[PDB]
Design a protein around this ligand. Structure first.
Ligand SMILES: *[C@@H]1O[C@H](CO)[C@@H](O)[C@H](O)[C@H]1NC(C)=O
Ligand SMILES: *[C@@H]1O[C@H](CO)[C@@H](O)[C@H](O)[C@H]1NC(C)=O
Ligand SMILES: *[C@@H]1O[C@H](CO)[C@@H](O)[C@H](O)[C@H]1NC(C)=O
Ligand SMILES: *[C@@H]1O[C@H](CO)[C@@H](O)[C@H](O)[C@H]1NC(C)=O
Ligand SMILES: *[C@@H]1O[C@H](CO)[C@@H](O)[C@H](O)[C@H]1NC(C)=O
Ligand SMILES: *[C@@H]1O[C@H](CO)[C@@H](O)[C@H](O)[C@H]1NC(C)=O
Ligand SMILES: *[C@@H]1O[C@H](CO)[C@@H](O)[C@H](O)[C@H]1NC(C)=O
Lengths: 201, 596
């Protein structure tokens, strides 16, 4: 029939500021019409790697909920946003499951997220005692204990601050320029699936 | 848990903050170099003080991890590099005195202005006022006046300063568990802990003497030929049996002999390989020069330049309003930012310099995957050698014909190859005894073999024995003749040029054997060869992670620096010089026979 109520993809992709990778934003998208061909046919995306589903049948299938996780990482760290990968982002910041169904969309944002003095508003958890579970968020700012001695809250010897800033500048190389990453997670649950694609007339 | 994991976490909180501070400092230095303004000087000084204070605090924090409880070789290498005290082990009063001495030597060398007595209304600085006189004059007493007046002023200012400098540097080095400051400089080539590939600080001097003993016949024949030609240029001053007078070598100190190519050319009647006019006729911009260099590096299989390279480099003189340093320098600013600062003219020299500096950029890009404190050459020789091999390959007539800069019907006979090889020998072979003699003299000064009252009597004795160059008039101990040169007055190692020269021809033979070149070594071009680029990039990707002996095994298949590729490179010239020296006398006498 006649279709209205499009899914809010403008508030995810066209957001004026993105979150840090340690505190990645998660938006649950439900009960609307998701047009994925607008994203796939855009020339503005550098990575559109979909795992577990193909982009051509996205516009046909229907899903119960859509999870839109948004963050900013480096250029060389986009490869770590994948199932089964290893690195600082995968182990300590944002972990994807092996049985992941969804798409990882990344694009260069050196124009917005880099300033000439250095943009230090973006952080990445550099140290944690254990690797993250999939879809876990760690926003703790407790001092990492690398040694037997107790830290006692002071960043002294062997006791380091967990979150380390990225220093984005516009004169950086392509492997160090900021990349905005949106990960869409598609799951089907026993509840009635309500996020369906648009139907042609 | 364990000490090794603690050191690894410390090395990560080092690396990640260090890369960003080194970036800030390097960007401030770049903004000073492209824009000489006093606030940029202040910003550079602030960034440098932050960088030095951060290195002091991390050196203070790195020493608390003992070395013998760490088994991973790379972690131990980074911790060894970080745990050096440097000047920090010395007391604050003596450290301030040493820093003041270094700064005042820098000001004396940089702002040294000398002109003729009784005509003091204007004076000439070293660059370019004295350089042009030394490189272009044909008058004996004018060059003698300039040489003696500059060594009088500079040496009589710098001699007590150098006497303080040697004592302070020896104190710092023995405080750092070294024998002397010469051992500290030789510790750059020290490899410890690798089975078979270990290299000692004491083996460096033995290897340098062993290679120079094989250098010596070629240099003796070249010296005899240059002596005969300078006898033709200056009829009565030069003796057939004696050494060359010091002020006649075409440069201020005798560092290079390349300004004597006009006087000592074998076949003037034959044409030159100058390609300047051809680029002027086709209107080659400096952008086209760098694009042709990039085409050379993509032809061998190396990665091409980043977009940020073309956006952020200064390849042209900015103008009258904005001042910049004219010296060509390749900058690895960090974080994938690679730039070249060169005031590029349309000349062959600037084109070869563009190839040399883009070779520096390729070397810097190759070890970008390494951790921050391992982002260097395996030694100080490789970093310059990988640019000099590009300077070798780009200068070949095959490369000039391939890019269209030379006529395809240009006749390559043996005479042009002889005079080209003689020019390359005056540039390359002539600097080797001067470099070896200077480093051996500085090593003997630091070791205490030469007392302070006997520095110059030994020094000229060394120059007659090794370089075959005699002083015009005798100098007493009020002179300081070595410290008139840039590297020795500003605390720089000097053996990097000797090691660079030998590694250059070793790499050249390795890549030409890889490229299956079937002719003479100097006729060899490494373009179009993917396997030569792969053999290069295997060593290039290592950086400082592996020992330089293992890197040399990776390229040439040898565990030590070798002298035979250089002699193979100049073998047509060696046979020609042996043919031309039948009537004349090869070798020199250390006596005062020409003039004293
Ligand atoms: C986001 O921004 C781009 C460029 O500004 C624009 O073309 C696009 O329509 C916007 N919205 C979406 C949903 O992509
Ligand atoms: C160089 O410095 C001057 C200082 O007055 C400034 O006005 C100018 O914009 C600078 N130029 C560049 C290219 O940085
Ligand atoms: C040494 O440490 C690096 C990481 O810092 C690691 O990749 C490498 O495998 C280690 N080498 C050995 C022999 O354990
Ligand atoms: C550096 O100096 C400190 C203090 O003098 C000393 O404890 C340390 O052993 C020195 N480092 C080395 C490598 O000798
Ligand atoms: C480097 O080479 C690749 C492939 O040949 C090309 O796509 C790229 O545009 C080149 N880089 C630049 C800055 O032109
Ligand atoms: C160059 O080649 C010609 C032709 O054989 C020969 O006569 C001449 O002696 C050669 N000269 C040298 C220096 O090899
Ligand atoms: C290298 O390859 C290019 C591309 O085919 C070719 O034009 C050039 O002539 C080659 N170089 C030589 C020396 O043949």
């Amino acid at each position: 029939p006649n279709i209205t109520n499009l899914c809010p993809f403008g508030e995810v992709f066209n957001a004026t500021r993105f979150a840090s990778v340690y505190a990645w934003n998660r938006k649950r998208i439900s009960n609307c019409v998701a047009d994925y061909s607008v994203l796939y046919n855009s020339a503005s995306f550098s990575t559109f790697k979909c795992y577990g589903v193909s982009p051509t049948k996205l516009n046909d299938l229907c899903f119960t909920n859509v999870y839109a996780d948004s963050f900013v990482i480096r250029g060389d760290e986009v490869r770590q946003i994948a199932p089964g990968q290893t690195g600082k982002i995968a182990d300590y910041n944002y972990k994807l499951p092996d049985d992941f169904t969804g798409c990882v969309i990344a694009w260069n944002s050196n124009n917005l997220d880099s300033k000439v003095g250095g943009n230090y508003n973006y952080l990445y958890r550099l140290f944690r005692k254990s690797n993250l579970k999939p879809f876990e968020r760690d926003i703790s700012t407790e001092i990492y204990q690398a040694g037997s001695t107790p830290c006692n809250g002071v960043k002294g010897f062997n006791c380091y601050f967990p979150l380390q800033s990225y220093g984005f500048q516009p004169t950086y190389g392509v492997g160090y320029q900021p990349y905005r990453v949106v990960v869409l997670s598609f799951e089907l649950l026993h509840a009635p699936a309500t996020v369906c694609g648009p139907k042609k007339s | 848990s364990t000490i090794e994991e603690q050191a690894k976490t410390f090395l990560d909180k080092f690396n990640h903050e260090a890369e960003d501070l080194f970036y800030q400092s390097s960007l401030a230095s770049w903004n000073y170099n492209t824009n000489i303004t006093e606030e940029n000087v202040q910003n550079m000084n602030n960034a440098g003080d932050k960088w030095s204070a951060f290195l002091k605090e991390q050196s203070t924090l790195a020493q608390m991890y003992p070395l013998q409880e760490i088994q991973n070789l790379t972690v131990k290498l980074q911790l060894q590099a970080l745990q050096q005290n440097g000047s920090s082990v010395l007391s604050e009063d003596k450290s301030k005195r040493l820093n003041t001495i270094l700064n005042t030597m820098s000001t004396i060398y940089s702002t040294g202005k000398v002109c003729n007595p009784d005509n003091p209304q204007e004076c000439l600085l070293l660059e370019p006022g004295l350089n042009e006189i030394m490189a272009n004059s044909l008058d004996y007493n004018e060059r003698l006046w300039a040489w003696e007046s500059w060594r009088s002023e500079v040496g009589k200012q710098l001699r007590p300063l150098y006497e303080e400098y040697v004592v302070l540097k020896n104190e710092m080095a023995r405080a750092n568990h070294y024998e002397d400051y010469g051992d500290y400089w030789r510790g750059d080539y020290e490899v410890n802990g690798v089975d078979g590939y270990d290299y000692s600080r004491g083996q460096l001097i033995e290897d340098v003497e062993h290679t120079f003993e094989e250098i010596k016949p070629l240099y003796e024949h070249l010296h005899a030929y240059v002596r005969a030609k300078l006898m033709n240029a200056y009829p009565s001053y030069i003796s057939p049996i004696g050494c060359l007078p010091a002020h006649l070598l075409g440069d201020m100190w005798g560092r290079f002999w390349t300004n004597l190519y006009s006087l000592t050319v074998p076949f003037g009647q034959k044409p030159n390989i100058d390609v300047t006019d051809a680029m002027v006729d086709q209107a080659w911009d400096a952008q086209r020069i760098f694009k042709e260099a990039e085409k050379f590096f993509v032809s061998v299989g190396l990665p091409n330049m980043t977009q940020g390279f073309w956006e952020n480099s200064m390849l042209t003189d900015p103008g009258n309003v904005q001042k910049a340093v004219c010296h060509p320098t390749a900058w690895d600013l960090g974080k994938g930012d690679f730039r070249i600062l060169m005031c590029t003219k349309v000349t062959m020299d600037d084109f070869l310099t563009a190839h040399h500096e883009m070779g520096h950029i390729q070397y810097d890009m190759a070890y970008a995957a390494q951790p921050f404190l391992l982002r260097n050459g395996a030694n100080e020789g490789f970093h310059e050698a990988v640019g000099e091999i590009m300077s070798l390959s780009a200068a070949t007539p095959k490369h000039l014909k391939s890019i269209g800069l030379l006529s395809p019907d240009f006749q390559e006979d043996n005479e042009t190859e002889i005079n080209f090889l003689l020019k390359q020998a005056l540039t390359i072979v002539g600097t080797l005894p001067f470099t070896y003699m200077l480093e051996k003299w500085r090593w003997m000064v630091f070791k205490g073999e030469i007392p302070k009252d006997q520095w110059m009597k030994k020094w000229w004795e060394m120059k007659r024995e090794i370089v075959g160059v005699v002083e015009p008039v005798p100098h007493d101990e009020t002179y300081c003749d070595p410290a008139s040169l840039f590297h020795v007055s500003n605390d720089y190692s000097f053996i990097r040029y000797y090691t660079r020269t030998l590694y250059q021809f070793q790499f050249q033979e390795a890549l030409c054997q890889a490229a299956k070149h079937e002719g003479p070594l100097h006729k060899c071009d490494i373009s179009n060869s993917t396997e030569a680029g792969q053999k290069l990039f295997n060593m290039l990707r290592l950086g400082k992670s592996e020992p330089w002996t293992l890197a040399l095994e990776n390229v040439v298949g040898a565990k030590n620096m070798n002298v035979r590729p250089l002699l193979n490179y100049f073998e047509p010239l060696f046979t020609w010089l042996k043919d031309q020296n039948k009537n004349s006398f090869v070798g020199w006498s250390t006596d005062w026979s020409p003039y004293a």
